[PDB]
Amino acid sequence: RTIKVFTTVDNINLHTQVVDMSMTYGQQFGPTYLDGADVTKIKPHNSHEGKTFYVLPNDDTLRVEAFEYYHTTDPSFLGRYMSALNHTKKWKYPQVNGLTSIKWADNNSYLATALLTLQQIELKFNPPALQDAYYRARAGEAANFCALILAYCNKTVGELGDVRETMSYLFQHANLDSCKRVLNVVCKTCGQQQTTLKGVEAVMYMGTLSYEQFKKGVQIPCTCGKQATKYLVQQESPFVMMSAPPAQYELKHGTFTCASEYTGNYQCGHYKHITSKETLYCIDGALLTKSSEYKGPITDVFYKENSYTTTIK
Amino acid sequence: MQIFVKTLTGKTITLEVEPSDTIENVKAKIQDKEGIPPDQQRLIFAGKQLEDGRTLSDYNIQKESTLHLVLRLRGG
Ligand SMILES: [Cl-]
Ligand SMILES: [Cl-]
Ligand SMILES: [Zn+2]
Secondary structure (H helix, E strand, O other), rough: EEOOOOOEEEOOOOOOEEOOOOOHHHHHHHHHHEEEEEOOOOOEEEHHHHOOEEEOOOOOHHHHHHHHHHHOOOHHHHHHHHHHHHHHOOOOEEEEEEEEEOOOOOOOOHHHHHHHHHOOOOOOOOOHHHHHHHHHHHOOOOOHHHHHHHHOOOOOOOOOOOOHHHHHHHOOOOOOOOOOEEEEEEEEEEEEEEEEEEEEHEEEOOOOOOOHHHHOOOOEOOOOEEEEEEEEEEOOHHHHEEEEEEEEEEEEEOOOOEEEEEOOOOOOEEEEEEEEEOOOEEEOEEEEEEOEEEEEEEEEEEOOOOEEEOOOO | OOEEEEEEEEOEEEEEEOOOOOOHHHHHHHHHHHHHHHHHHEEOOEEEEEOOEOOOOOOOOOOOEEEEEEEEEOEE
């Protein structure tokens, strides 16, 4: 006795299989999943006829397809993605003034903040998996995108998280190749040192939330023992992320794209997302509060950019 | 060679290091001196996040250079 089923690594390229109904999926395919559920130790059932099963790559065809879809060789990736998916399919993805959010569940506030952010910055994902899941997420069906973010960032459902770290890992999988940052450090004694950063390093900064302050100059130690001034010479990127340890900060309407608010301490906290539209919006999972002003403990601010050149001589 | 590491309180820490030391190596030296677990630590050089499995030489960090130690957030 046998049924036909489809095996896949990507849910786009399906491989017809004839499965011996007296053996477990595991003995026949290796590790096997059905709509996120692990069926490795399970024997084929009648109503499995015609259904699609994910399998761990166990041959050169599945290996190539897996790499082309996900851009990773981690053999733990599929199981981690499938484990997260069982939870993320149970979350609720409300539309909050045209953006997909997540209702609070399983310590997901950092994830909802990242998801809202990704819908507001210009980013091209390289892995087809992230490109496809992103478009579904933007339409309200974000479960696969959320499970992929957890898999790529090596996070488990319910684990506490850092938006800055989540954005950073996801940016490794974005086409930021042509993003460029030039910095100048001026010591009155030693002279001027210019540095060029590219890709992810060109769009991140940890130390100040203010894009304007980065342009104007920040005081840093010079190895001579004096204070030097560091300033942005040139920025070529569609956005910048400015981060700092969480601190009371005033967000002014029209002067930024969106921001992460972190309330709590280094053991436990809660993120809210602030975005600048016709007024200031504070999105807390499914809840939306509109205000003319906002002050709170901010840790990330995103600004839109194309090309900036300093006038500092 | 010595580097300096500024903590969130403004405490400055001296470490003994070598240009080929990985970031993980520097995190152990801070775990030794302050007892902070390496997994909580994030090392910053003049705004740039230093990543595990790159060296001080990779980032052109030289003697008398100052790093910043920040900690991962725990949002839920
Ligand atoms: Cl496939
Ligand atoms: Cl994309
Ligand atoms: Zn100097």
